[PDB]
């Protein structure tokens, strides 16, 4: 069942009006940048909570500025479009909102659509992925800034992901050109060793993850954990007590193993279970301390 | 004015029937590979000549195999689709045919369309581009095989191309991760110094260019020129007597200068003028020696 | 109008006595190291203030030790030579003092001259440079230690600087062999984002800048600013609220833009305006807190 | 005893008139490029033979073009200046001629001098050097094109040369950034293994040596030797039957050993002895086959 | 059943006399170099044929010279030791002979043993391996010369080999630090595409394989095949018509696939079947053209 | 005089029973990992103190897990084996204990021996080494994780060590692939500049040194010193006030110089003398603050 609506170039339109030609936009897709924004439905409150909407909208405006898309949309327009579309679609459950900006062909024009679709959350569930390091190297600033969340950056993140599946793993992790740990294919990665949390620093060649930012805040401020952002080596992650992938799509995804070295305290391990549960209570609006991360959209009870 | 038809998933359909949803295929575009195939119209013969159709169709099948698209189309189907579409569209002039293959979401499905549109040839004309080397590095086998003609590989080739335009040049050339000359943004590059032709070897990190292959054949076999495929240094190209970009879209594009070092014998220089003219007579079907490169489509005089 | 004097090999001599043969010292210039030392004239006090003379003289002795020039001069001799020459020249305005050490040809001999010339300060003025990243890579420890302030290190810093001018920019910034931000051509670079100050760490492959050291002190101790010395990525600097070049010659030079991405809070931006003004009051001897950085030379009012 | 004359900026002048200020030209020396040209005195013929004068003069014009020195001198002017100065100096023995071009400070001016001094030839003598590989890496196209014979490129070639002397060797050889054999500090290197001659290819990151060019011609055309220009590994050179350094200053310099691995057939080994003797007979004008490499300057018997 | 004898430090001794302490030689094993030499038993002739004994013995002396083991053994001693041991052991079938040299601890002493054990040949059999590229990078000249056949070089070649087995492949192939194809874990690799044979050049960072040398000779001289020794890219090998591993242990080992891309003409493919059969007839002494590669040891019929 | 006993595969046995065949274990030695554990004899207390036994035993279990040796031994077994062997050998002086684990050949078996031998301590003595940087590059995570204390990792650490000796130095220091300071050949390195202690961070590509860990603790907690773990450049170490190598074998080894640049405050310098003396009092059991690092083995007075 399609959403009722989507937003396209400054306006909400019924889903079925947004038809284009098969041959529109394949060249535009080379330039395209996107965000993935979560909405979490609190049936008790009859409110959707859109997680860090403004951070996502600012990350998009920056990705657009680095692609050098001419100015057409604002942060406030993308935030309001997302609010308006989640209300108008009238779906009272968890959603993914996806803004996607693209430049169409000298005088390129900037366009964008936003669509919101139902999403499955796994923050109640206890599951684990078996990860491998890819024989494929992560994109770097020299060739393809990981900082831009460009569709093209995912060509790199399907060399790794299809390798991982055909060799019997659930997920790929990347090494950077210099042999250091980069990120997952769609997400940042965390390692627990002791109860010290470890994650690659930004200049390891990764996206400016809002989830990574969120986890680091929650780990330091709720749990009092030490969190190291640093150059991380492959072999030390094999020795991790726990590991997880985090991102908007990934929420908190435990890693059971890495190149078949098994995380000592399981998956989800204790620090992972804690961070997963705190995350969940934040995003569903049952933690008043983190309220400023949440954009409510009142829609009335399901 | 749109073409009458296009080919999509094993069938020709009127142009206007190929409508999809705005939100179809943005994830598929990450995987997408394409060819650009030239058709040259000989009004004297009333035939379109499709240049090296089978090489293009085989390059596409290989690009698809390296992306790991499941098998759905054959070389012979792509060659025949292109013949059939150029006839059915009933346009008696120069065309670009563009097959584009993409995988749609475990059990991914392989899809492809082909569309043929009128094209402007510049093989009569004498023009020249001012080129710069980009401060952006070419994609390599470690991160994004240049060998695959993937839409995503063009994200790299618009870092360079937009830099080139905003800094007052017509076109970008690339250096590889190791500092050696790679290719243009959409084309291979040739240098003339003496009347020795020079072009980067394939493992410099370039596409397996059919035009590059064609030029090397024509330079050796018609002109008796020495042609070096080797590691090429930046500074020596500044000292080139001539330079040109070559590809299907680019045909033979003379470079007047490179980072404002001007090619000594102009643009097009003498060896460039020769190769341009021989190319033109080959592709338009007025050189019986190269006939096996040509797929005629008889359509009757314009 | 030439200075009255200069210092050469342990002695002050009239300017016109320091004549050599056209063919002396071109081989010596390969080895040569130098400092640029500022003197700031306070007409109210009738004193020249020589900025961080001993740091400059120690940096020179170290540059000499790393070149492996045999010992001939001392730190104290270079400090006193600079004091004596600024007095003897009897010029009551802002000056640049330039010690230059060189080895002359087994048993190489160490020589040095120091000359002081009038200098224009721009610390009253509000101006801005448009910067590009160079397609040329910074020298590293593997080939040419950036730590040594050798004339030869400037061959690298005129690949970048002449590129920048011919492509319509005022100044070049460098990327290191690994693609990270290095420095300007003659100066260290600072970025303001938030009001967090950011500058590459030393092992990014930069000179041990006294101005950079000075700015970091002034930013932390006068302004209470956070200052990050770290690996800095190209794309984040495009997103900078402000940027500036700093060095002895450069003082504080605001950057309006970088590869045509414009710094959000202008040039000079607010944190830049503050640091410029504090710097100025320090170097001119109107800030008693920083007095230990200043070597007064009393000469009587202009 | 000084030469009678030198050439400076389009004119011959007595040696003693070419006096400048100690402080002229230290910044210009960063830009400076030079050639070293040999003159060989044949007392039997009363002629100096200037070796490959035009190649040297063209290499200089190219080095100048790559530095981007504005045009001021011609190839023919440098060739004639060198002829005229060797006649006017009236020294009837072996000489080194050294053109040195430099740009003086927006609107930079191009200047050049040429001076000719007596030189000791070692082509009668049988001597050998003990070489080490340097822990310092050769300059590459990314940072400092080895192709430009710039004074600054010798800062790199005194990291290696002073290391070599203090660790008990006569001479340094370089490895490139990728770990492959580059060149000596002032010369190209040849290895003999079998009686196959081996030397790094140009894009190993070396100067376009006229001596290297000369040796390769003489090895192929007089001796019928196989000569490989290719990527050369460190360890294989340890296993060389012979090795030598060649250049204008170096003529043919045998290497007895490399990191204390001794060349099997000694120094000079047999192929080295042959090439040394053929070189000598070429440069002294007693080999009519190579006459086109020689510019005679008749001056009458010593 | 143990061999009757082995050779150790210049003498043949019964197998059971060669007992040492558990704690002897673990430090020596860091330095150790070895060869693997094949003996092929021709029961018709009652002769063992030892394949390219002198090449193997010279490769060992070179490996020893590069490790800097003091001189103790000669090429002729290793050749004769191997002859004598294969006779004295009195085993009339295919054997592996393994010389292993090691330095024991200032004044290190050089030691060596040689032992010959029965070996299974697979040159009658038609079998195939499924290969992966390793996420582990091959050792290079910078860190560990692949040219030395050192036991330590196999630590690298069990990162790859254990990865390959746990991820469901039969064998690992390596990429070099620069992302190009290096070798297998114990063998060189060949690709057939067309009927052009392709194999990495030596400076791709590989061992000087005698089998690789043998195959290239046999391919050119018996089959008239084109054989390219060059930089080889990962993706092109996926497109290979055939592939094989070759070495002393490996003989000719067909590769059915590489990262699950299947070689078009199977395994063994036609050119592979030919080269396998020619190899077999060479090593068993039924090809008089290649007799100079064979060291017969007459022992009388089995 | 041999020890009375050693431990092998879960049991203590007389020294003379541990005899194997010359040809056992040369392939196993490729996989082998080891620790070096110090025992310090306090004749006053009649106790051996085994330094950080559990850290060493855990480092071994991790090295074994990363090699992928099947589980056979425990941490507690290695700790108890070492205690038991030092008692049973009945030697009342300083010892080195060396566990060495190895896998013997599909279904590899894990084996280990431990042997304890008398050791000379140099912690009373004042001596100094002259160090060079090696022209050989340190092993990295890409090829050979420095994190694993594998015998094979020492092949790299005898390229450097034999270079150092033949070029007149006492010891080699390494640069990493990126040109930064790695470690010594068998030890971590510390630099003193000011009285700030500096040592490369782990991801510089070094072993997880227990001695390095110990020194950093003692420097911070006893001396209140600042200790920087960071990327360290070659040239800054030349400017060090002091330097030392530290490890189990090396204890605290002062460096007098580095590529003949002499440490300003001598060797051992003051901070080095302090750390040496504190280390000594810790390991000999005369510092109750560090008692938890010590495993006593009471044996009665010598
Ligand atoms: C989006 C993304 C992430 C996670 O970022 P969030 O802002 O938390 O969604 C990680 N890696 C890649 C490659 C991404 O594109
Ligand atoms: C297609 C392409 C070329 C030229 O190849 P042709 O087969 O001659 O069209 C060159 N460079 C790039 C990046 C390409 O994609
Ligand atoms: C001198 C210099 C600087 C600035 O250092 P100061 O001590 O502040 O003058 C920056 N970059 C380079 C390349 C320099 O030579
Ligand atoms: C000049 C030079 C050579 C040799 O070139 P010739 O033209 O034969 O003198 C080799 N190496 C370097 C670095 C040089 O500058
Ligand atoms: C020995 C070896 C080979 C093959 O060499 P042969 O002389 O043919 O046995 C290939 N790779 C490695 C790593 C080797 O050690
Ligand atoms: C063991 C070792 C060290 C020092 O580690 P400790 O645990 O202090 O003995 C340093 N470098 C290397 C290469 C080592 O193997
Ligand atoms: Na609203
Ligand atoms: Na047809
Ligand atoms: Na004074
Ligand atoms: Na004349
Ligand atoms: Na015999
Ligand atoms: Na006990």
Author numbering:
A (entry chain A), B (entry chain A), C (entry chain A), D (entry chain A), E (entry chain A), F (entry chain A): 6 to 110, 118 to 314
Paper text:
Transaminases (TAs; aminotransferases; EC 2.6.1.) are pyridoxal-5’-phosphate (PLP)-dependent enzymes that catalyze the reversible stereoselective transfer of an amino group from an amino substrate to a keto acid or ketone, thereby producing a chiral amine or amino acid and a new keto compound. TaTT is distinguished by an expanded substrate specificity: it can catalyze the amino group transfer between BCAAs and α-ketoglutarate, producing α-keto acids and L-glutamate (benchmark reactions for BCATs), and between R-PEA and α-ketoglutarate producing ketone and L-glutamate (R-TA-like activity). The functional dimer of TaTT is close to the dimers of known BCATs; however, the P-pocket comprises only one site for the α-COOH group binding, and the O-pocket is enriched with hydrophobic residues, which disturb the alternation of hydrophobic and hydrophilic residues typical of BCATs. Generally, the active site is a combination of two pockets: the O-pocket on the phenolic side of the PLP and the P-pocket on the phosphate group side of the PLP.
The mP3O1 variant, harboring a triple mutation in the P-pocket and the mutation S115R in the O-pocket loop, showed the highest affinity to R-PEA. The variant mP3O1 showed the highest specificity for R-PEA: three mutations in the P-pocket together with a mutation S115R in the O-pocket loop improved the productive binding of R-PEA as well as the effectiveness of the amino group transfer. It is noteworthy that the achieved effect was not a sum of the effects induced by the separate mutations in the P-pocket (mP1 + mP2) and O-pocket (mO1); rather, it was the cumulative effect of the four mutations (G41V + Y101F + R43S + S115R). Mutation R43S in both variants led to a shift of the β-turn and the interdomain loop toward the active site: about 0.6 Å between the corresponding Cα atoms of H261 and V132. Substitution of a side chain of R43 induced the flexibility of the H261 side chain in both variants, which is reflected by the high B-factor (mP3) or even the absence of the electron density for the side chain (mP3O1). There are large conformation changes in the O-pocket loop in the mP3 and mP3O1 variants; moreover, in mP3O1, this loop is partially disordered (residues 113–117 have no clear electron density). The S115R mutation in the O-pocket loop induced its disordering and increased the W32* side chain flexibility. In mP3O1 (mP3 + S115R), W32* has two conformations: one is similar to that in mP3, and the other is unique and occupies the WT position of the O-pocket loop main chain. As an imitation of the R-TAs’ pyruvate-binding site, the introduction of S115R in mP3 was unsuccessful: the productive binding of pyruvate in the proD-position (through the coordination of the α-COOH group with the side chain of R115 in the O-pocket loop) was not achieved. The HPLC analysis of the products of transamination between R-PEA and pyruvate catalyzed by mP3O1 revealed only L-alanine.
